Design an enzyme around this catalytic site. Structure first.
Site, PDB file in Angstrom:
ATOM      1  N   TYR A   1       2.249  -6.893  -4.101  1.00  0.00           N
ATOM      2  CA  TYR A   1       3.591  -6.952  -4.673  1.00  0.00           C
ATOM      3  C   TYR A   1       4.540  -7.619  -3.687  1.00  0.00           C
ATOM      4  O   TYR A   1       4.458  -7.379  -2.485  1.00  0.00           O
ATOM      5  CB  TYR A   1       4.111  -5.553  -5.029  1.00  0.00           C
TER       6      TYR A   1
ATOM      7  N   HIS B   1      -0.232  -3.680  -0.806  1.00  0.00           N
ATOM      8  CA  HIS B   1       0.359  -4.673   0.072  1.00  0.00           C
ATOM      9  C   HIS B   1       1.034  -3.918   1.216  1.00  0.00           C
ATOM     10  O   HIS B   1       1.671  -2.896   0.978  1.00  0.00           O
ATOM     11  CB  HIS B   1       1.397  -5.506  -0.692  1.00  0.00           C
TER      12      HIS B   1
ATOM     13  N   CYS C   1       4.017 -12.824  -2.003  1.00  0.00           N
ATOM     14  CA  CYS C   1       3.089 -11.960  -1.295  1.00  0.00           C
ATOM     15  C   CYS C   1       1.828 -11.639  -2.107  1.00  0.00           C
ATOM     16  O   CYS C   1       0.769 -11.355  -1.541  1.00  0.00           O
ATOM     17  CB  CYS C   1       3.847 -10.688  -0.885  1.00  0.00           C
TER      18      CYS C   1
ATOM     19  N   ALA D   1       7.539 -11.216  -3.151  1.00  0.00           N
ATOM     20  CA  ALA D   1       8.368 -12.354  -3.545  1.00  0.00           C
ATOM     21  C   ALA D   1       8.212 -12.902  -4.960  1.00  0.00           C
ATOM     22  O   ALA D   1       7.108 -12.970  -5.513  1.00  0.00           O
ATOM     23  CB  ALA D   1       8.192 -13.492  -2.534  1.00  0.00           C
TER      24      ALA D   1
ATOM     25  N   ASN E   1       4.278  -6.992   8.054  1.00  0.00           N
ATOM     26  CA  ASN E   1       4.089  -7.564   6.726  1.00  0.00           C
ATOM     27  C   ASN E   1       3.672  -9.035   6.813  1.00  0.00           C
ATOM     28  O   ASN E   1       4.496  -9.898   7.109  1.00  0.00           O
ATOM     29  CB  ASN E   1       5.388  -7.456   5.926  1.00  0.00           C
TER      30      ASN E   1
ATOM     31  N   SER F   1      19.390  -1.648  16.098  1.00  0.00           N
ATOM     32  CA  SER F   1      18.572  -0.488  15.745  1.00  0.00           C
ATOM     33  C   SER F   1      17.616  -0.121  16.872  1.00  0.00           C
ATOM     34  O   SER F   1      17.696  -0.679  17.968  1.00  0.00           O
ATOM     35  CB  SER F   1      17.788  -0.748  14.453  1.00  0.00           C
TER      36      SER F   1
END
Lengths: 334, 334
Positions: A319, A258, A122, A321, A289, A38
């Site tokens: 929000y 988050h 998280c 895992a 993240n 990418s």
């Protein structure tokens, strides 16, 4: 006929400060595009991430938490002697035991205070913040440290074009204690274990240890499932957090969801219908993240840049895992 | 000028029930010490351990926790729908993520409820129970499941004559909810982070993963140092717990110290100055040291044999890894 005594602390608790630590090394999108098909523009438009921070080899979730805590204390004008407990929330302490909390406490000069590690994916920060407030109001402590810390870089599979550019390292801590007026709203949380595989370590450590010649563990992320879940359901959790806090959507000055994906968060902004001038955390741009350390790091970025200010009403929404979430309204710290 | 609201829950809470799951396979001392030429009788004389249970290959910390919870629910005459949140305390969930709590909640049919994993070494139960009580009194939940679970067998080095016979597998859960009179005393906790190496996984998972050919990680336990600390400090911990609960030593009907060493527990009974007829938990004999699940498993063994009865005033003292301890006085459950 024997009656068990009941204790109680200060009902009014709040964030006395936030302290953040981000490793020195900067890792650009193009720096990981050597093993992926990418581009830098694709990553940014799909996630909102430009650069990320990776901790040094000699650093760990625990060492970064120590650094974050020292900074939080300093910013609060306190020392470890004023702290009664420490909750370390992480997902990257690579030791089944001992937990990180005790050693972190010792590194601050308070080897004997209570403390434990909290893992909820998280959303560990949200749960940790709520547990700290619950403990303090209950009288089990008066002032506490809650530190989110993550060293995710070693768990990233550079060849996984699905998430190699998502996760990063860092740590941020907050001092929680008595305040003139309520600074931490009721905790709103939940989960969905039916989608526990959406974000996971693919091979458990024991299966790996019993066959060290095979494939080693790496973090895997099912992007579409996470997006569909968070973008469409965190709006309702956010409303529940504001309702429980007794505040209206238009009274929210800052929104700190988050930092998982810019696109998800942009949809949440639209869904929550906050004031057009509400400040939204976008620390993901150069932080990526950082899981459990995500929202406290984002809060720190907003405060150090002036975007957010002490006293501001902020909506926190974690929000991630396990597919668990934790949200609450709080008053931004100093 | 906005006032963040404050919620409130049942001021009086207690243990509504306890449920235990002990894996089928019985493992004798010679079976883990077949790799060492040590005395079968010595293990029992020194630690009080005769046999321990080992979980099957298809079992995990999570699966045992689920079963323990089902049984706890049954013993309390409650359904998964009656549960508002679950805390899983363990040190042997061999996945950095997702956490076990969401999975256990899904398996039980307790769809979407809040939950998280808590690791405080062997003292995770006391911390988790205190957190559940704190959350309920805070109004963040009305009824909760707190389950200690461990599958330590895969971390045991059969050739380590120092601790091959110590750890074991099992899980036990308790239901925490409102009760007519206070059933859970104030939490008394702390640690000694400067002795973090006393109980530990010797090699962190990442170092191992980056050198799969090298030595595999195992759980090490420095017996001399750990028991020295326990003998020296748990007595005062127990007294602080009783004092916080407003009870005298002569009022304790049941003593539930961590099941790590029978001789230490005997030393504590004396130091604590408990009544001669006070029932002392010794589940360690055929359960071994199950870390986070030790106390709740010990509570269940006492209740299933009739040694202890619901309502009995009990003193719980957990201590272990990371060198953490958590204690509290409670009313025995069903």
């Amino acid at each position: 006929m024997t009656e068990i005594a009941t204790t109680s602390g200060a009902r009014s608790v709040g964030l006395l400060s936030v302290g953040a630590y981000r490793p020195e090394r900067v890792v650009t999108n193009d720096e990981i595009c050597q093993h992926i098909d990418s581009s830098d523009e694709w990553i940014y438009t799909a996630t909102g991430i430009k650069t990320r921070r990776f901790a040094a080899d000699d650093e760990s979730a625990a060492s970064m938490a120590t650094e974050a805590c020292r900074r939080a204390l300093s910013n609060a004008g306190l020392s470890a002697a004023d702290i009664d407990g420490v909750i370390v929330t992480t997902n990257t302490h690579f030791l089944q035991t001992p937990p990180a909390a005790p050693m972190v406490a010792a590194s601050l000069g308070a080897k004997g205070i209570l403390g434990f590690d909290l893992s909820a994916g998280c959303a560990g920060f949200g749960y940790a913040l709520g547990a700290a407030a619950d403990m303090i109001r209950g009288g089990g402590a008066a002032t506490m440290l809650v530190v989110g810390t993550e060293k995710l870089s070693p768990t990233i599979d550079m060849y996984d074009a699905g998430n190699c550019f998502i996760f990063a390292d860092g740590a941020a801590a907050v001092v929680v204690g008595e305040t003139p007026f309520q600074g931490i709203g009721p905790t709103v949380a939940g989960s969905d274990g039916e989608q526990a595989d959406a974000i996971r370590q693919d091979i458990d450590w024991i299966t790996f240890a019993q066959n060290p010649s095979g494939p080693r563990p790496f973090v895997r992320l099912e992007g579409p499932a996470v997006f569909r879940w968070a973008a469409f359901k965190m709006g309702d959790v956010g409303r529940r957090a504001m309702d429980a806090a007794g505040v209206r959507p238009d009274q929210i000055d800052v929104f700190v969801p988050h930092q998982a994906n810019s696109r998800i968060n942009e949809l949440l902004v639209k869904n929550l219908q906050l004031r057009p001038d509400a400040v939204v955390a976008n620390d993901i741009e150069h932080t990526g993240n950082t899981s459990a350390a995500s929202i406290p790091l984002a809060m720190a970025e907003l405060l150090t840049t002036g975007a957010a200010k002490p006293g501001d009403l902020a909506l926190l929404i974690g929000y991630g895992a396990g597919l668990s979430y934790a949200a609450q309204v709080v008053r931004m710290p100093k």
